[PDB]
Ligand binder design. Sequence first.
Ligand SMILES: Nc1nc2c(ncn2[C@@H]2O[C@H](COP(=O)(O)OP(=O)(O)O)[C@@H](O)[C@H]2O)c(=O)[nH]1
Ligand SMILES: [Mg+2]
Length: 163
Amino acid sequence: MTEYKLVVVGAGGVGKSALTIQLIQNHFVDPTIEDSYRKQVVIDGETCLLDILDTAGQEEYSAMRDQYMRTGEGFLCVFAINNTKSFEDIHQYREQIKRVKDSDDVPMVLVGNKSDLAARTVESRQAQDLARSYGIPYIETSAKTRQGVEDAFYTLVREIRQH
Ligand SMILES: Nc1nc2c(ncn2[C@@H]2O[C@H](COP(=O)(O)OP(=O)(O)O)[C@@H](O)[C@H]2O)c(=O)[nH]1
Ligand SMILES: [Mg+2]
């Protein structure tokens, strides 16, 4: 069976775990433990197996994180739309992924999470522009309402398929 190795990266607190648990278990929810989840799904008719690594356990740029990240095929790069720092951080996360995969074109999607919360501090247009300047998709999402959550992950699989 076709497996898709996915990795969820981004600043602590943006909703990585909430997005993953919503995708896998269909409900909304330890920010230090790092682990992988699996689930058999059908995407565009293809029955397949997602293997999802939920990163945590310190900002980033330890070799330990790379030891975990290196096995990933595609990356879900998440920020929170009310946390400007988490959005600035995407540049670094993207750089770290390119270095660990030793590639200039790694399957990746930008995810603006916490779409249910108002008074956003990152406008959609700006995030759409970042994704476009990177040549990757942008999906907005809420781990809380589930809006956009399948679109974000399934989109990542479609990027893996096309690379
Ligand atoms: N309102 C709202 N809160 C969220 C969302 N996603 C995560 N959270 C909350 O943000 C905090 C961090 O979420 P978590 O998934 O643990 O973030 P992580 O550190 O990136 O794994 C927790 O209070 C979560 O319940 C979301 O989409 N909407
Ligand atoms: Mg977490």
